[PDB]
Amino acid sequence: SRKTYTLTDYLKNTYRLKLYSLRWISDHEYLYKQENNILVFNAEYGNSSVFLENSTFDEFGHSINDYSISPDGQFILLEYNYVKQWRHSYTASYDIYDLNKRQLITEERIPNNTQWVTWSPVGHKLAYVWNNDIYVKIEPNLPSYRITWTGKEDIIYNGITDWVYEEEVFSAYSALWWSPNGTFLAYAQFNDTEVPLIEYSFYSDESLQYPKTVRVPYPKAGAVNPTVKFFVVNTDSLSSVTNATSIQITAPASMLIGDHYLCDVTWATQERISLQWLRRIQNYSVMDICDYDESSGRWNCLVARQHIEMSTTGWVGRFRPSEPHFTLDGNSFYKIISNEEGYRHICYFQIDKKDCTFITKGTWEVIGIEALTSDYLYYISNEYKGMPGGRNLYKIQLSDYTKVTCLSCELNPERCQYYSVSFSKEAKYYQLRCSGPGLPLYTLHSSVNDKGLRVLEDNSALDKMLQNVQMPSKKLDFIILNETKFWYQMILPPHFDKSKKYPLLLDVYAGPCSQKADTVFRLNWATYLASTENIIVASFDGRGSGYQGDKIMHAINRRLGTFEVEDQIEAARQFSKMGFVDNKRIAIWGWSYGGYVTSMVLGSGSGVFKCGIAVAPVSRWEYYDSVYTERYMGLPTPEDNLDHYRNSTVMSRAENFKQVEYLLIHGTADDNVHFQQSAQISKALVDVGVDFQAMWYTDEDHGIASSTAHQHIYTHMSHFIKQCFSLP
Amino acid sequence: SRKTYTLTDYLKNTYRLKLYSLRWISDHEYLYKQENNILVFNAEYGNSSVFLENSTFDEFGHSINDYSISPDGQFILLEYNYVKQWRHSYTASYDIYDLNKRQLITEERIPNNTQWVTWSPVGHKLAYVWNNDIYVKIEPNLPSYRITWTGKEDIIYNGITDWVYEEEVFSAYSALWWSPNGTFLAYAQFNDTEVPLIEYSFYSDESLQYPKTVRVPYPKAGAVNPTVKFFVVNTDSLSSVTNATSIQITAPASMLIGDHYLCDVTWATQERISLQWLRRIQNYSVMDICDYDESSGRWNCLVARQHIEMSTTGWVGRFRPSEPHFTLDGNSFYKIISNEEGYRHICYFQIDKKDCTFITKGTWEVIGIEALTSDYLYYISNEYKGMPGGRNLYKIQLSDYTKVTCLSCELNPERCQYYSVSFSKEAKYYQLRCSGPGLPLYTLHSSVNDKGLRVLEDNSALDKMLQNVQMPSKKLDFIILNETKFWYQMILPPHFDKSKKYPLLLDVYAGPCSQKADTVFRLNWATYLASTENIIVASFDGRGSGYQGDKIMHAINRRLGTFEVEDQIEAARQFSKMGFVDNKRIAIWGWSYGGYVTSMVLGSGSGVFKCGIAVAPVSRWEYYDSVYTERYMGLPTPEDNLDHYRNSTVMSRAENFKQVEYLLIHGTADDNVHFQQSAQISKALVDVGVDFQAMWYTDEDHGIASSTAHQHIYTHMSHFIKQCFS
Numbered sequence A: 001s002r003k004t005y006t007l008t009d010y011l012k013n014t015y016r017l018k019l020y021s022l023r024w025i026s027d028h029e030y031l032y033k034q035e036n037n038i039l040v041f042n043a044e045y046g047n048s049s050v051f052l053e054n055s056t057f058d059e060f061g062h063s064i065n066d067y068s069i070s071p072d073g074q075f076i077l078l079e080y081n082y083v084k085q086w087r088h089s090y091t092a093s094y095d096i097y098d099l100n101k102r103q104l105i106t107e108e109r110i111p112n113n114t115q116w117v118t119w120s121p122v123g124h125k126l127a128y129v130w131n132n133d134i135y136v137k138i139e140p141n142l143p144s145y146r147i148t149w150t151g152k153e154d155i156i157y158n159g160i161t162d163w164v165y166e167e168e169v170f171s172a173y174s175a176l177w178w179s180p181n182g183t184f185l186a187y188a189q190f191n192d193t194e195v196p197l198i199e200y201s202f203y204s205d206e207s208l209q210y211p212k213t214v215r216v217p218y219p220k221a222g223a224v225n226p227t228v229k230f231f232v233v234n235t236d237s238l239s240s241v242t243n244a245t246s247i248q249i250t251a252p253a254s255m256l257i258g259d260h261y262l263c264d265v266t267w268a269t270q271e272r273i274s275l276q277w278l279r280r281i282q283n284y285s286v287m288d289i290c291d292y293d294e295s296s297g298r299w300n301c302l303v304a305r306q307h308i309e310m311s312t313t314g315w316v317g318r319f320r321p322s323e324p325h326f327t328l329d330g331n332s333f334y335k336i337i338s339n340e341e342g343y344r345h346i347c348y349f350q351i352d353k354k355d356c357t358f359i360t361k362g363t364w365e366v367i368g369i370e371a372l373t374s375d376y377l378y379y380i381s382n383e384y385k386g387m388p389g390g391r392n393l394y395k396i397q398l399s400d401y402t403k404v405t406c407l408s409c410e411l412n413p414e415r416c417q418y419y420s421v422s423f424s425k426e427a428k429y430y431q432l433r434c435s436g437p438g439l440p441l442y443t444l445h446s447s448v449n450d451k452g453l454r455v456l457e458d459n460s461a462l463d464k465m466l467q468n469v470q471m472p473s474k475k476l477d478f479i480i481l482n483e484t485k486f487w488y489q490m491i492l493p494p495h496f497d498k499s500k501k502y503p504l505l506l507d508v509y510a511g512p513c514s515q516k517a518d519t520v521f522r523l524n525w526a527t528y529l530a531s532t533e534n535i536i537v538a539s540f541d542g543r544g545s546g547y548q549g550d551k552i553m554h555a556i557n558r559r560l561g562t563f564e565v566e567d568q569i570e571a572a573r574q575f576s577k578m579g580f581v582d583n584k585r586i587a588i589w590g591w592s593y594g595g596y597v598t599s600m601v602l603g604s605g606s607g608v609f610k611c612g613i614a615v616a617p618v619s620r621w622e623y624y625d626s627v628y629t630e631r632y633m634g635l636p637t638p639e640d641n642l643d644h645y646r647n648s649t650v651m652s653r654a655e656n657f658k659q660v661e662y663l664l665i666h667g668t669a670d671d672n673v674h675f676q677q678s679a680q681i682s683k684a685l686v687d688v689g690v691d692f693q694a695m696w697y698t699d700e701d702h703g704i705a706s707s708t709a710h711q712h713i714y715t716h717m718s719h720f721i722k723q724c725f726s727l728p
Numbered sequence B: 001s002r003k004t005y006t007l008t009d010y011l012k013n014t015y016r017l018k019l020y021s022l023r024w025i026s027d028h029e030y031l032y033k034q035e036n037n038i039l040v041f042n043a044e045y046g047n048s049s050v051f052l053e054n055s056t057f058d059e060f061g062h063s064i065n066d067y068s069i070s071p072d073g074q075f076i077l078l079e080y081n082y083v084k085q086w087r088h089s090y091t092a093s094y095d096i097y098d099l100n101k102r103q104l105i106t107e108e109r110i111p112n113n114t115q116w117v118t119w120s121p122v123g124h125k126l127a128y129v130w131n132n133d134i135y136v137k138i139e140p141n142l143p144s145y146r147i148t149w150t151g152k153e154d155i156i157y158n159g160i161t162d163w164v165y166e167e168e169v170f171s172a173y174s175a176l177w178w179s180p181n182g183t184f185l186a187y188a189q190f191n192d193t194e195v196p197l198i199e200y201s202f203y204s205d206e207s208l209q210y211p212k213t214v215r216v217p218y219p220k221a222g223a224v225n226p227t228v229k230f231f232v233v234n235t236d237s238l239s240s241v242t243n244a245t246s247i248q249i250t251a252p253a254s255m256l257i258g259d260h261y262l263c264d265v266t267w268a269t270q271e272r273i274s275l276q277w278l279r280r281i282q283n284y285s286v287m288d289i290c291d292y293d294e295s296s297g298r299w300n301c302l303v304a305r306q307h308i309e310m311s312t313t314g315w316v317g318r319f320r321p322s323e324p325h326f327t328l329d330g331n332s333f334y335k336i337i338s339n340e341e342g343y344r345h346i347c348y349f350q351i352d353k354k355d356c357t358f359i360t361k362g363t364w365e366v367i368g369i370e371a372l373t374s375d376y377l378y379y380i381s382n383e384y385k386g387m388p389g390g391r392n393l394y395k396i397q398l399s400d401y402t403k404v405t406c407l408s409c410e411l412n413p414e415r416c417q418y419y420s421v422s423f424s425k426e427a428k429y430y431q432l433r434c435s436g437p438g439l440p441l442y443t444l445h446s447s448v449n450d451k452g453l454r455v456l457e458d459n460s461a462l463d464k465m466l467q468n469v470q471m472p473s474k475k476l477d478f479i480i481l482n483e484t485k486f487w488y489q490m491i492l493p494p495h496f497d498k499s500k501k502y503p504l505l506l507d508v509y510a511g512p513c514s515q516k517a518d519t520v521f522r523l524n525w526a527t528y529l530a531s532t533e534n535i536i537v538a539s540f541d542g543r544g545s546g547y548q549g550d551k552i553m554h555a556i557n558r559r560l561g562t563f564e565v566e567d568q569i570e571a572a573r574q575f576s577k578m579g580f581v582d583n584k585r586i587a588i589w590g591w592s593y594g595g596y597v598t599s600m601v602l603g604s605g606s607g608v609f610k611c612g613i614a615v616a617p618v619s620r621w622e623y624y625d626s627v628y629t630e631r632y633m634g635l636p637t638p639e640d641n642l643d644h645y646r647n648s649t650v651m652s653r654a655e656n657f658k659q660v661e662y663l664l665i666h667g668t669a670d671d672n673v674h675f676q677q678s679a680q681i682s683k684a685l686v687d688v689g690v691d692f693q694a695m696w697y698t699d700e701d702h703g704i705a706s707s708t709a710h711q712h713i714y715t716h717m718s719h720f721i722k723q724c725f726s
């Protein structure tokens, strides 16, 4: 009677979630990439028109992986020869297609191996980075104007982030910000001169006779960090002079006193930019508000205008200080910060007033500010039903904070408890995306009265297909520990019978501000383990987890590898005492940070776990990068936090691995959690004579995501788990 | 009833073979390092005396790992701070102890980080290499004299070998040869300026925050090779202000025409040195015989004096041209070369006569020339009983080749069929070392009438211990394939009963000139697998194997990865048809070349094998070094043998691994077979969706020999084999 969701179904994507990715081009229309052609849609009525034919670029000779239309609709940037670099960065070739002449531009082309390109927010100016230097094109076909000359590979970065800034602060390769109407181009510059290099072998295709050594400026905990400078250049002055002057905006004095980071840049108006800076000891940040001085040509940041944001119990922000959302005239802004109770809420600032006023409050948190009009501020929070793993869209009246309306809570409470949103240019319309607990649902709405214009995609096709397979169910609930409630989730085998005893697999991440217990609908490895192997796959959000206030989130401050580890063990103890858990068959696994916690758990000697798998785990904090590591652990020095850095390694627990079955997996070209980390774990296990299972993945990185490797690792891990569980 | 030989027994060395390592110091006495003190023994009678007390160096503050006594007995070189490099190279600190003053010398000490040191063959002169340059000390306490100034790390090597010459041609780090009485010091210079570098991470102790990248000049097949020059300096013409002049000896001409190697250097007299050169296409070599010209100060090598040694069916030599053994007057010499039938035998040469005369012949081979006197030539061969895996010592009368005497054959035919030998300085005495098939046995003899003076060590203590454990037995026999007989051996479980069906593990190496079927007694992993797990562990010597003639050895010429692989599959088929082998439980495993063969067999789709383990395998010949690879494969160019280089990779067979259980093991710091080789196998397997087991060993090299990793690898492999064999 009906098959189950099998490993091959997971690895071959037989059941696919349908999406609806649109791109707003104005306050009334959006583009909808339709594999073959790209159409333009009128939000009001739903009618469309082809914007670009699928055959428009047939005899290009190059497969196009993406495009970007200029804001004024006159040009289309064609991206090809895509070559991935880190999590966000990549290089590529670009051609520009004129839409009014319907001709590809052939003169003054963007160079090959370009690192980043972006249209101005209005019109059709272009700014790109090539060979670590910035270039600006006023017209697509005319010569570029070079803005920087200091660009040097692995050394000086203009307009793009170095490794640690890409991964840990901006979550982007780009380090340039056009002003609202395109007049000014602002950019950061990184000096990695004294940053040490992580080096590792890349084997490449079998044809390469000698392996290549990859080398990357990467600051490990406590090592020399990149330094940064910020500049603003007036692009409108490029005809008139040669070598346009880049005006530098420097430090707030309270930052210059030592190592610091640029963590946020947000343009407020055509002549006002705000910058947030953060000290290397990440519990103090400052926001500067800088105005262009028309008769000086400078950018001045009034000291009375600065805003300090700090924390006494931890670091600043969830992963960094939040971004401001300025009003029209840029004289005020809203920002999510931790209130006096440790809960992140929106507060209202006046640019020259030291104190801000909170406009939301309660024992829940605002996830993010989504849109701001003269009338309302739109935001997502987990307020509904008191569930930290749910997400809904709310709107608060700016003239009366008493008028808070939830726009998504009630649309379909049964199927939808987790939403994200995309507003049109002036917030006239918005697309709501529901991701769980039922199948994804995309709808379009008009902001006037919040009416739901129509259903964009409801995955009805996947729904028909799934009723023919025994799919698992998912319970989201909580347990109480020392008067505090902690949430957990369980992917339950089909026809779950609490009368029976099921083997259990603890799927963990548990890094700071993480959340593994939510209402999102997923089709992943756990779906298969529960559906086909009848294994319960649980996750627990303990101390250190996010979106529930700083009391819980900062509990691991300066103490990584302690409570978040203990709380996972306790959770497994609690689960086992629920009655439907086979005590003798409890396992644990995790990937990055989750691999670390898994290994720490397995070496705890708790006796609770029979076996476990760690994929690309951190093994000692001194091996990971400075920005992420120090944010939670401070510095690795006698003076500050070296004792705990040395007390929380996986290596020191090697001996206890004699009690469990361990599978250690790592990609050899992991630029993020270096193969080094697992190479040291394996060496310590060998040194104490502990037998374990291993698998390296040649040339895979932190995601072990190439098509073949992804299939191979989940296959190898499925065999290990069924063996450990005495089942097929 | 009695325990078996277990895994722990093997890993903890509970049963230890006893040895008798002596060091001849003259034609009448030898030193015997006793793990406390070192004594000196009189060969004739067997009486001894302490030569150095065990407490002579207590408050040194340094553990001494070795020492060397000057040929004149006046000094003792003390080696400490030993830091291993490759298979033979290493660096160390040295101090010289004066024996007549019983004082450690404190001035003009040998530098720290010294790379090589060697007393002159007579007296007490010293030649050492520090920072890649040669230095000479006429007296232990006086300043040294710099001989070379060109030494540069990874770059110019004077008196020491670079990576590939250390591993593949000289099997040593030393590249200097003192003349007989210490007058001249000959040396080579290895120029690696265009040799590419192999680079790999080294993680070190957990304290190291960032991994270090090790880089070694290493020519992979077909890459730019190091170049070499040969010099001779007169150590007697010393100077406080003078660079001694190094006289260079250049190439034959037939060598200078292309890439070549210096493969052998043997001093013939006080003023005659012979040198053998090999072309990069290793099927042609030339011996030069050079004499010092007293009135020129030069070394001339008369063209009419050179000897050419070549092969039409393969390369020259077993792994390289054999070395010559010169007569007293250096006007004639004996050398093992392949005769017209393909069998290696001793040939007698006159330095200015082109043709040589064979003094031994037959379908067996001379393994090596061990000693030469005016009277006789002593050698080891596998002639006895026609068994190629047996070794015995013979002597042939130089005046009458009809007088050939076997000196070891009959001593104890039951216990001893494999010997090595160590003669005193003038060959007045010799120590025979029997290594199987029974327990090792060391005896001492006098060359006069070949009397066996006495038993030095007979392992009677291990014998008593072993009778209390169920030890496996060993069968050495053969099978015939196409009219040719090929040898094999089986380590048989205790109480072997050919009525039962046993799982079988094929233990393979099979590289060119290899021999895995012999009469040597061993206590290893196979002993445990047979004794405790009841697994038959077999080995087979097929095409390409050595010591049986060029017809069999050269069969794989330019064809590595073909017949030696097929022959292992065929042997496994034959074994299964013997009746006592369980067909459903046949596995195979090997290390290095054996790992390559194991992987090729497992990827053949023959269906014969259920599972296998490859340790540090070669996976594609373009990844291994030039000297070894090109010896059997020629060059990887379309004009030469590129097609076969590309057809013999393990990766091309990825798909067929779907049928077997495979365990792939490699050390991450392997400087010999780079981790790269296994990294490419694992990647080809992943690309075709084949599951397999793997294990990398952090910071281990080709030997995966550190105490903890050795134990770990064998424990992991044992679990894998038992799982595969229920």
Ligand SMILES: *[C@@H]1O[C@H](CO)[C@@H](O[C@H]2O[C@H](CO)[C@@H](O[C@H]3O[C@H](CO)[C@@H](O)[C@H](O)[C@@H]3O)[C@H](O)[C@H]2NC(C)=O)[C@H](O)[C@H]1NC(C)=O
Pocket: B150, B156, B191, B192, B193, B194
């Ligand atoms: C080890 O081997 C290296 C490579 O063969 C040697 O090197 C190099 O040195 C020679 C010096 O003559 C250079 O010769 C060229 O330059 C001169 C003048 O410009 C010309 O007259 C001549 O015709 C050549 O064009 C080589 O360019 C140079 N090759 C390199 C750098 O690889 C090296 O000297 C040798 N080491 C020792 C100690 O001998």
Ligand SMILES: N[C@@H](CC(=O)N1CCCN(C(=O)c2ccc(C(=O)O)cc2)CC1)Cc1cc(F)c(F)cc1F
Pocket: A167, A168, A171, A318, A319, A511, A592, A593, A617, A618, A624, A628, A672, A673, A702
């Ligand atoms: N380097 C780390 C980066 C990181 O934690 N984040 C950035 C990328 C992915 N994440 C996000 O983008 C994201 C998460 C949360 C928020 C928010 O609530 O404000 C916003 C963005 C989660 C944080 C992840 C990481 C941690 C490890 F401990 C590790 F060993 C490897 C890693 F890749």
Ligand SMILES: N[C@@H](CC(=O)N1CCCN(C(=O)c2ccc(C(=O)O)cc2)CC1)Cc1cc(F)c(F)cc1F
Pocket: B167, B168, B171, B318, B319, B511, B592, B593, B617, B618, B628, B672, B673, B702
């Ligand atoms: N590099 C190779 C060196 C090698 O084959 N020899 C040198 C060291 C050990 N051997 C010997 O010393 C030796 C072997 C034979 C003889 C003789 O009969 O003349 C003399 C010495 C065997 C040859 C071994 C090797 C081969 C591989 F294919 C590989 F993947 C790794 C290796 F280390």
Ligand SMILES: *[C@@H]1O[C@H](CO)[C@@H](O[C@@H]2O[C@H](CO)[C@@H](O)[C@H](O)[C@H]2NC(C)=O)[C@H](O)[C@H]1NC(C)=O
Pocket: A040, A041, A042, A045, A047, A048, A049
């Ligand atoms: C969607 O439909 C509207 C309504 O018909 C289109 O707007 C009309 O465009 C035509 C031009 O062909 C004019 O004659 C009308 O006066 C327009 N009426 C308006 C402004 O409502 C609109 O172009 C369509 N949009 C898309 C993207 O197809």
Ligand SMILES: *[C@@H]1O[C@H](CO)[C@@H](O[C@@H]2O[C@H](CO)[C@@H](O)[C@H](O)[C@H]2NC(C)=O)[C@H](O)[C@H]1NC(C)=O
Pocket: A149, A150, A151, A243
């Ligand atoms: C103005 O443009 C110039 C010329 O294109 C830039 O000057 C060069 O900059 C590099 C440093 O990256 C120097 O090595 C050259 O010597 C400079 N030559 C000059 C002065 O033309 C210059 O960087 C730009 N202006 C400023 C202040 O950066």
Ligand SMILES: *[C@@H]1O[C@H](CO)[C@@H](O[C@@H]2O[C@H](CO)[C@@H](O)[C@H](O)[C@H]2NC(C)=O)[C@H](O)[C@H]1NC(C)=O
Pocket: A181, A182, A183, A236, A270, A271
């Ligand atoms: C884009 O913004 C810039 C900067 O505010 C505008 O340029 C200024 O225009 C005002 C006129 O209203 C002048 O007083 C200033 O001298 C200009 N500043 C300069 C020269 O940078 C520009 O008008 C805006 N673009 C558009 C089309 O609105």
Ligand SMILES: *[C@@H]1O[C@H](CO)[C@@H](O[C@@H]2O[C@H](CO)[C@@H](O)[C@H](O)[C@H]2NC(C)=O)[C@H](O)[C@H]1NC(C)=O
Pocket: A281, A283, A310, A311, A312, A313, A634
């Ligand atoms: C920001 O973090 C640093 C480090 O935790 C705090 O300064 C340290 O405070 C502790 C007290 O718990 C002392 O032991 C150290 O000597 C201090 N080190 C210094 C002054 O560098 C600092 O106070 C924190 N700031 C806030 C707002 O709490």
Ligand SMILES: *[C@@H]1O[C@H](CO)[C@@H](O[C@@H]2O[C@H](CO)[C@@H](O)[C@H](O)[C@H]2NC(C)=O)[C@H](O)[C@H]1NC(C)=O
Pocket: B281, B283, B310, B311, B312, B313, B634
């Ligand atoms: C030494 O080996 C080389 C390479 O095999 C021999 O030269 C090649 O001989 C083959 C014939 O089988 C030809 O196809 C090639 O064109 C030859 N290449 C050359 C001339 O370099 C060479 O003859 C061998 N020497 C001996 C003694 O047999």
Ligand SMILES: *[C@@H]1O[C@H](CO)[C@@H](O)[C@H](O)[C@H]1NC(C)=O
Pocket: A035, A036, A037, A054, A055
């Ligand atoms: C291109 O567009 C046409 C017109 O609607 C459509 O029928 C066709 O399927 C598209 N081709 C591709 C490659 O999807």
Ligand SMILES: *[C@@H]1O[C@H](CO)[C@@H](O)[C@H](O)[C@H]1NC(C)=O
Pocket: A093, A109, A110, A111, A112
């Ligand atoms: C980029 O490289 C291509 C070769 O693929 C070459 O034809 C072209 O001229 C280069 N320049 C640009 C901007 O495409």
Ligand SMILES: *[C@@H]1O[C@H](CO)[C@@H](O)[C@H](O)[C@H]1NC(C)=O
Pocket: A150, A156, A191, A193, A194
């Ligand atoms: C980068 O910093 C280095 C090292 O501290 C200094 O030499 C250099 O001037 C800086 N580079 C630039 C262009 O600012």
Ligand SMILES: *[C@@H]1O[C@H](CO)[C@@H](O)[C@H](O)[C@H]1NC(C)=O
Pocket: A481, A482, A484, A566
């Ligand atoms: C509750 O407090 C006890 C007592 O210190 C401790 O053992 C336990 O780990 C705590 N649990 C939580 C959720 O903090």
Ligand SMILES: *[C@@H]1O[C@H](CO)[C@@H](O)[C@H](O)[C@H]1NC(C)=O
Pocket: B036, B037, B054, B055
């Ligand atoms: C050598 O020194 C060791 C060290 O304890 C001692 O046991 C042994 O008896 C000594 N042997 C002689 C012959 O002095």
Ligand SMILES: *[C@@H]1O[C@H](CO)[C@@H](O)[C@H](O)[C@H]1NC(C)=O
Pocket: B042, B045, B047
């Ligand atoms: C060894 O013993 C013999 C026989 O008595 C004796 O003549 C000889 O001198 C001894 N060795 C030495 C060098 O004293």
Ligand SMILES: *[C@@H]1O[C@H](CO)[C@@H](O)[C@H](O)[C@H]1NC(C)=O
Pocket: B093, B109, B110, B111, B112
């Ligand atoms: C190295 O050896 C030299 C030469 O004898 C000596 O003076 C020096 O102290 C040694 N170095 C160390 C660090 O022991």
Ligand SMILES: *[C@@H]1O[C@H](CO)[C@@H](O)[C@H](O)[C@H]1NC(C)=O
Pocket: B149, B242, B243
């Ligand atoms: C000996 O010759 C070398 C090679 O030119 C030279 O560098 C060195 O200085 C000479 N010896 C001395 C001490 O001058």
